[PDB]
């Protein structure tokens, strides 16, 4: 069994307890992430190495290197009988609009599949 801990800003943490398994897929994380973070879209998440350096996972592949490191980290811990830390991941904050530095659009009256049109409305 593996526990992933999701750090969520100004809230707390979510602990995801995996199956097992196999196999953990990058999507399985993204899907859990978006499920605990419903008001956002998250394409990516980081995690820390021994140095405390964030390393980003954008896909499978890099998923495999996270699992490799964390499994090493797990081995060493209760060999020394230490308390086993969950794998902690930091979802990469993605911009909402956000992107739109400015402006709006009217939707009350459309009509209207025009060409030079469109002849209709209402309100």
């Amino acid at each position: 069994v593996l526990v992933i801990r999701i750090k969520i800003p100004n809230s707390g943490a979510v602990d995801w307890t995996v199956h097992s398994g196999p196999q953990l897929l990058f999507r399985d994380v993204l899907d859990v992430i978006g499920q605990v973070l419903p008001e956002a879209t998250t394409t990516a998440f980081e995690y820390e190495d021994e140095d405390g350096d964030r390393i980003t996972v954008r896909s499978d592949e890099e998923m495999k290197a996270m699992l490799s490191y964390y499994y090493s980290t797990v081995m060493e811990q209760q060999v020394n009988g230490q308390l086993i830390e969950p794998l902690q991941i930091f979802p990469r904050a993605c911009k909402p609009p956000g992107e739109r530095n400015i402006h709006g659009l009217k939707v009350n009256t459309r009509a209207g599949p025009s060409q030079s049109g469109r002849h209709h409305h209402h309100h």
Binding site: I6, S11, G12, A13, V14, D15, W16, T17, L25, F26, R27, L30, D31, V32, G34, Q35, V36, T41, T43, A44, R58, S59, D60, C94, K95, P96, P97, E99, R100, N101, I102, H103, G104, L105, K106, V107, T109, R110, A111, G112, P113, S114, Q115, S116, G117, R118
Partner: protein, 355 residues
């Protein structure tokens, strides 16, 4: 056959949208009060092609999560009983309008609106294209829009991936259908080269449409379409003219005086320098000379909005095997039912939140 029984999770408010393969309606999730679109697809297994197209639509939309691609929030579980389950209900983000309604209105659409709409469109596409998915019918009405100018790509029933091994070209064109106005030369000419570039011809048409606020190539039938294009682009070089696969349209291509391109600066006289430069890079006969959505995102015209970190690829590519071309109608119903179940079965409150 439009009657919505969604009952008790959702309350139906009017009807917004119509087409084939379904009818859409505004709705409000009862207890939360969250506003959604609900799209009913009446008797969705009754016809093998509509069946595939439906399964195709669910799998594609489940795969994506992107702010520029329309998202399935829910898919209603079969109501009581199975009883030869017929109509499929899918819940989506409620979008107020669409780009066609925006482009054609007495409402102002500034250069800045075209920049931001074009950016968001290209964003979602970079994403979809890296999944190895070609939309294949991209037109202003398929691009949903709201008051804040969020743009989201819809209508994935025409999307196909691949192309596969040398087959199927030819049968790449079945079933499909699309307006010739946004249709790409390789789809018109059976050029035996079908890539994500297909969509980028459509973008150029949409881009040009937004600048002039009128359709760029509104052909009244096949050769007229072929002609309207050739007016501005000139005639296709011998290499493409010889790359034509049928009819022979190659004949009548071989005919006609060789024409010359018209600079986009005359076809859009009063138009932004940069916009035209990017528009030019998208509209080209040969699919391989067409700029990619990924590279178009880096064009100076979009420089204001460009964010390398905010423009994701789609992590695993979409897998289009499951292609149903014969693949009996019942087994298709099974798979559509196989989704919707999995969709719900992937929650799984499997987690705990620290207090």
């Amino acid at each position: 056959d439009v009657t919505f029984d969604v009952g008790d999770e959702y309350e139906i408010i009017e009807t917004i949208g119509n087409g084939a393969y379904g009818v859409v309606s505004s709705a409000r999730r009862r207890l939360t009060g969250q506003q959604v679109a609900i799209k009913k697809i009446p008797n969705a297994f009754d016809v093998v092609t509509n069946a595939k197209r439906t399964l195709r639509e669910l799998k594609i939309l489940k795969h994506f999560k992107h702010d520029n691609i329309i998202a399935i929030k829910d898919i209603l579980r079969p109501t009581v009983p199975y009883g030869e389950f017929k109509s499929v209900y899918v819940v989506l983000d409620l979008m107020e309008s669409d780009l066609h309604q925006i482009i054609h209105s007495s409402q102002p659409l500034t250069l800045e609106h075209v920049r931001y709409f074009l950016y968001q469109l290209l964003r979602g596409l970079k994403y979809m294209h890296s999944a190895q998915v070609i939309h294949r019918d991209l037109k202003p009405s398929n691009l949903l829009v709201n008051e804040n100018c969020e743009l989201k790509i819809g209508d994935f029933g025409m999307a196909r991936g691949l192309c596969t091994s040398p087959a199927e070209h030819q049968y790449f064109m079945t079933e499909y259908v699309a307006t010739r106005w946004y249709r790409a030369p390789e789809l018109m000419l059976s050029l035996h080269e079908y890539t994500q570039a297909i969509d980028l011809w459509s973008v150029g048409c949409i881009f040009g449409e937004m600048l002039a606020r009128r359709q760029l190539f509104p052909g009244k039938n096949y050769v007229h379409q072929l002609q309207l294009i050739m007016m501005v682009l000139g005639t296709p070089s011998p290499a493409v003219i010889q790359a034509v696969g049928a009819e022979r349209v190659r004949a009548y291509i071989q005919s006609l005086p060789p024409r010359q391109p018209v600079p986009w600066e005359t076809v859009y006289p009063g138009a932004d320098r940069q916009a035209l430069s990017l528009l030019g890079r998208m509209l080209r006969f040969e699919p391989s000379a067409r700029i990619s959505a990924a590279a178009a995102l880096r064009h100076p015209f979009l420089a204001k909005y460009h964010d390398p970190d905010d423009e994701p690829d789609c992590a695993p590519p979409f897998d289009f095997a499951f292609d149903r071309e014969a693949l009996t109608r019942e087994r298709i119903k099974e798979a559509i039912v196989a989704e919707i179940e999995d969709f719900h079965a992937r929650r799984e409150g499997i987690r705990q939140q620290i207090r």
